PDB file of all heavy atoms in Angstrom:
ATOM      1  N   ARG F 179     -23.993  -2.004 -18.905  1.00  8.25           N
ATOM      2  CA  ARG F 179     -22.686  -1.364 -18.619  1.00  8.25           C
ATOM      3  C   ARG F 179     -22.913   0.130 -18.397  1.00  8.25           C
ATOM      4  O   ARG F 179     -23.974   0.632 -18.804  1.00  8.25           O
ATOM      5  CB  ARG F 179     -21.707  -1.556 -19.780  1.00  8.25           C
ATOM      6  CG  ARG F 179     -21.515  -2.998 -20.221  1.00  8.25           C
ATOM      7  CD  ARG F 179     -20.259  -3.573 -19.626  1.00  8.25           C
ATOM      8  NE  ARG F 179     -20.154  -5.008 -19.834  1.00  8.25           N
ATOM      9  CZ  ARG F 179     -19.319  -5.799 -19.176  1.00  8.25           C
ATOM     10  NH1 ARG F 179     -18.504  -5.294 -18.266  1.00  8.25           N
ATOM     11  NH2 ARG F 179     -19.291  -7.093 -19.435  1.00  8.25           N
ATOM     12  N   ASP F 180     -21.934   0.800 -17.787  1.00  7.01           N
ATOM     13  CA  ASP F 180     -21.935   2.264 -17.546  1.00  7.01           C
ATOM     14  C   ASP F 180     -22.273   2.980 -18.859  1.00  7.01           C
ATOM     15  O   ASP F 180     -21.500   2.858 -19.819  1.00  7.01           O
ATOM     16  CB  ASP F 180     -20.596   2.725 -16.974  1.00  7.01           C
ATOM     17  CG  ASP F 180     -20.363   2.265 -15.548  1.00  7.01           C
ATOM     18  OD1 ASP F 180     -21.261   1.582 -14.994  1.00  7.01           O
ATOM     19  OD2 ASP F 180     -19.291   2.585 -15.006  1.00  7.01           O
ATOM     20  N   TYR F 181     -23.410   3.678 -18.881  1.00  4.83           N
ATOM     21  CA  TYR F 181     -23.963   4.400 -20.055  1.00  4.83           C
ATOM     22  C   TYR F 181     -23.897   5.901 -19.751  1.00  4.83           C
ATOM     23  O   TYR F 181     -24.808   6.424 -19.083  1.00  4.83           O
ATOM     24  CB  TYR F 181     -25.378   3.889 -20.341  1.00  4.83           C
ATOM     25  CG  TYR F 181     -25.961   4.304 -21.666  1.00  4.83           C
ATOM     26  CD1 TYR F 181     -25.649   3.621 -22.833  1.00  4.83           C
ATOM     27  CD2 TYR F 181     -26.845   5.361 -21.752  1.00  4.83           C
ATOM     28  CE1 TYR F 181     -26.195   3.986 -24.053  1.00  4.83           C
ATOM     29  CE2 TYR F 181     -27.397   5.742 -22.965  1.00  4.83           C
ATOM     30  CZ  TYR F 181     -27.070   5.055 -24.117  1.00  4.83           C
ATOM     31  OH  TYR F 181     -27.610   5.437 -25.303  1.00  4.83           O
ATOM     32  N   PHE F 182     -22.817   6.553 -20.192  1.00  5.54           N
ATOM     33  CA  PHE F 182     -22.516   7.987 -19.949  1.00  5.54           C
ATOM     34  C   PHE F 182     -23.161   8.840 -21.040  1.00  5.54           C
ATOM     35  O   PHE F 182     -23.107   8.469 -22.213  1.00  5.54           O
ATOM     36  CB  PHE F 182     -21.007   8.240 -19.932  1.00  5.54           C
ATOM     37  CG  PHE F 182     -20.299   7.783 -18.682  1.00  5.54           C
ATOM     38  CD1 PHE F 182     -19.568   6.606 -18.679  1.00  5.54           C
ATOM     39  CD2 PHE F 182     -20.331   8.543 -17.522  1.00  5.54           C
ATOM     40  CE1 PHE F 182     -18.898   6.190 -17.537  1.00  5.54           C
ATOM     41  CE2 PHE F 182     -19.653   8.131 -16.383  1.00  5.54           C
ATOM     42  CZ  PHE F 182     -18.943   6.952 -16.390  1.00  5.54           C
ATOM     43  N   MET F 183     -23.731   9.980 -20.661  1.00  6.39           N
ATOM     44  CA  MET F 183     -24.443  10.870 -21.609  1.00  6.39           C
ATOM     45  C   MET F 183     -24.094  12.330 -21.321  1.00  6.39           C
ATOM     46  O   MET F 183     -24.033  12.699 -20.150  1.00  6.39           O
ATOM     47  CB  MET F 183     -25.955  10.670 -21.488  1.00  6.39           C
ATOM     48  CG  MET F 183     -26.431   9.382 -22.110  1.00  6.39           C
ATOM     49  SD  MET F 183     -28.147   9.042 -21.684  1.00  6.39           S
ATOM     50  CE  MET F 183     -27.936   8.469 -19.998  1.00  6.39           C
ATOM     51  N   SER F 184     -23.884  13.121 -22.370  1.00  6.50           N
ATOM     52  CA  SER F 184     -23.925  14.602 -22.307  1.00  6.50           C
ATOM     53  C   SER F 184     -25.354  15.018 -21.969  1.00  6.50           C
ATOM     54  O   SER F 184     -26.282  14.213 -22.092  1.00  6.50           O
ATOM     55  CB  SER F 184     -23.480  15.203 -23.611  1.00  6.50           C
ATOM     56  OG  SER F 184     -24.499  15.040 -24.590  1.00  6.50           O
ATOM     57  N   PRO F 185     -25.584  16.277 -21.537  1.00  7.55           N
ATOM     58  CA  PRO F 185     -26.944  16.774 -21.310  1.00  7.55           C
ATOM     59  C   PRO F 185     -27.869  16.639 -22.533  1.00  7.55           C
ATOM     60  O   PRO F 185     -29.037  16.337 -22.352  1.00  7.55           O
ATOM     61  CB  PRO F 185     -26.701  18.250 -20.955  1.00  7.55           C
ATOM     62  CG  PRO F 185     -25.334  18.238 -20.326  1.00  7.55           C
ATOM     63  CD  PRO F 185     -24.556  17.276 -21.198  1.00  7.55           C
ATOM     64  N   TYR F 186     -27.342  16.846 -23.743  1.00  8.73           N
ATOM     65  CA  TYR F 186     -28.133  16.796 -25.004  1.00  8.73           C
ATOM     66  C   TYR F 186     -28.498  15.342 -25.328  1.00  8.73           C
ATOM     67  O   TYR F 186     -29.616  15.095 -25.800  1.00  8.73           O
ATOM     68  CB  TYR F 186     -27.403  17.526 -26.137  1.00  8.73           C
ATOM     69  CG  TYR F 186     -27.611  19.017 -26.096  1.00  8.73           C
ATOM     70  CD1 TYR F 186     -26.600  19.878 -25.698  1.00  8.73           C
ATOM     71  CD2 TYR F 186     -28.847  19.566 -26.406  1.00  8.73           C
ATOM     72  CE1 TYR F 186     -26.803  21.247 -25.637  1.00  8.73           C
ATOM     73  CE2 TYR F 186     -29.069  20.933 -26.345  1.00  8.73           C
ATOM     74  CZ  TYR F 186     -28.041  21.780 -25.963  1.00  8.73           C
ATOM     75  OH  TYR F 186     -28.251  23.133 -25.907  1.00  8.73           O
ATOM     76  N   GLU F 187     -27.603  14.396 -25.054  1.00  8.96           N
ATOM     77  CA  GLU F 187     -27.893  12.945 -25.215  1.00  8.96           C
ATOM     78  C   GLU F 187     -28.980  12.537 -24.207  1.00  8.96           C
ATOM     79  O   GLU F 187     -29.894  11.788 -24.601  1.00  8.96           O
ATOM     80  CB  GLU F 187     -26.604  12.135 -25.074  1.00  8.96           C
ATOM     81  CG  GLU F 187     -25.656  12.326 -26.245  1.00  8.96           C
ATOM     82  CD  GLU F 187     -24.239  11.815 -26.046  1.00  8.96           C
ATOM     83  OE1 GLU F 187     -23.830  11.593 -24.896  1.00  8.96           O
ATOM     84  OE2 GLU F 187     -23.540  11.645 -27.054  1.00  8.96           O
ATOM     85  N   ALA F 188     -28.903  13.039 -22.970  1.00  9.61           N
ATOM     86  CA  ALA F 188     -29.867  12.767 -21.878  1.00  9.61           C
ATOM     87  C   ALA F 188     -31.250  13.322 -22.242  1.00  9.61           C
ATOM     88  O   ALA F 188     -32.259  12.681 -21.892  1.00  9.61           O
ATOM     89  CB  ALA F 188     -29.363  13.351 -20.578  1.00  9.61           C
ATOM     90  N   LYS F 189     -31.298  14.486 -22.894  1.00  8.00           N
ATOM     91  CA  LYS F 189     -32.556  15.105 -23.381  1.00  8.00           C
ATOM     92  C   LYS F 189     -33.188  14.187 -24.432  1.00  8.00           C
ATOM     93  O   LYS F 189     -34.384  13.877 -24.296  1.00  8.00           O
ATOM     94  CB  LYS F 189     -32.291  16.493 -23.972  1.00  8.00           C
ATOM     95  CG  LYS F 189     -33.549  17.267 -24.334  1.00  8.00           C
ATOM     96  CD  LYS F 189     -33.284  18.573 -25.030  1.00  8.00           C
ATOM     97  CE  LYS F 189     -34.549  19.163 -25.612  1.00  8.00           C
ATOM     98  NZ  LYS F 189     -34.250  19.973 -26.811  1.00  8.00           N
ATOM     99  N   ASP F 190     -32.409  13.780 -25.440  1.00  6.52           N
ATOM    100  CA  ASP F 190     -32.847  12.845 -26.516  1.00  6.52           C
ATOM    101  C   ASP F 190     -33.364  11.543 -25.894  1.00  6.52           C
ATOM    102  O   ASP F 190     -34.341  11.000 -26.411  1.00  6.52           O
ATOM    103  CB  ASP F 190     -31.710  12.523 -27.489  1.00  6.52           C
ATOM    104  CG  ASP F 190     -31.361  13.660 -28.426  1.00  6.52           C
ATOM    105  OD1 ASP F 190     -32.150  14.625 -28.497  1.00  6.52           O
ATOM    106  OD2 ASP F 190     -30.299  13.571 -29.077  1.00  6.52           O
ATOM    107  N   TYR F 191     -32.717  11.067 -24.831  1.00  6.16           N
ATOM    108  CA  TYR F 191     -33.028   9.783 -24.154  1.00  6.16           C
ATOM    109  C   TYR F 191     -34.331   9.891 -23.352  1.00  6.16           C
ATOM    110  O   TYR F 191     -34.956   8.841 -23.123  1.00  6.16           O
ATOM    111  CB  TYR F 191     -31.865   9.378 -23.246  1.00  6.16           C
ATOM    112  CG  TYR F 191     -31.794   7.900 -22.971  1.00  6.16           C
ATOM    113  CD1 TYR F 191     -31.085   7.054 -23.805  1.00  6.16           C
ATOM    114  CD2 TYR F 191     -32.448   7.344 -21.883  1.00  6.16           C
ATOM    115  CE1 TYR F 191     -31.022   5.692 -23.561  1.00  6.16           C
ATOM    116  CE2 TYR F 191     -32.393   5.985 -21.624  1.00  6.16           C
ATOM    117  CZ  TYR F 191     -31.678   5.155 -22.467  1.00  6.16           C
ATOM    118  OH  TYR F 191     -31.627   3.815 -22.211  1.00  6.16           O
ATOM    119  N   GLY F 192     -34.709  11.097 -22.911  1.00  4.31           N
ATOM    120  CA  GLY F 192     -35.920  11.350 -22.101  1.00  4.31           C
ATOM    121  C   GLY F 192     -35.644  11.387 -20.602  1.00  4.31           C
ATOM    122  O   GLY F 192     -36.623  11.303 -19.820  1.00  4.31           O
ATOM    123  N   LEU F 193     -34.374  11.513 -20.199  1.00 10.04           N
ATOM    124  CA  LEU F 193     -33.950  11.609 -18.772  1.00 10.04           C
ATOM    125  C   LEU F 193     -34.120  13.044 -18.263  1.00 10.04           C
ATOM    126  O   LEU F 193     -34.366  13.198 -17.053  1.00 10.04           O
ATOM    127  CB  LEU F 193     -32.498  11.149 -18.626  1.00 10.04           C
ATOM    128  CG  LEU F 193     -32.276   9.644 -18.751  1.00 10.04           C
ATOM    129  CD1 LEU F 193     -30.807   9.334 -18.952  1.00 10.04           C
ATOM    130  CD2 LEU F 193     -32.809   8.908 -17.532  1.00 10.04           C
TER     131      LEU F 193
END
Side-chain angles (χ1 to χ4, degrees):
Chain F
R179 307 261 170 195
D180 290 0
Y181 193 82
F182 285 102
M183 286 170 284
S184 74
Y186 278 107
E187 290 167 342
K189 187 185 168 209
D190 287 347
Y191 204 89
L193 287 165

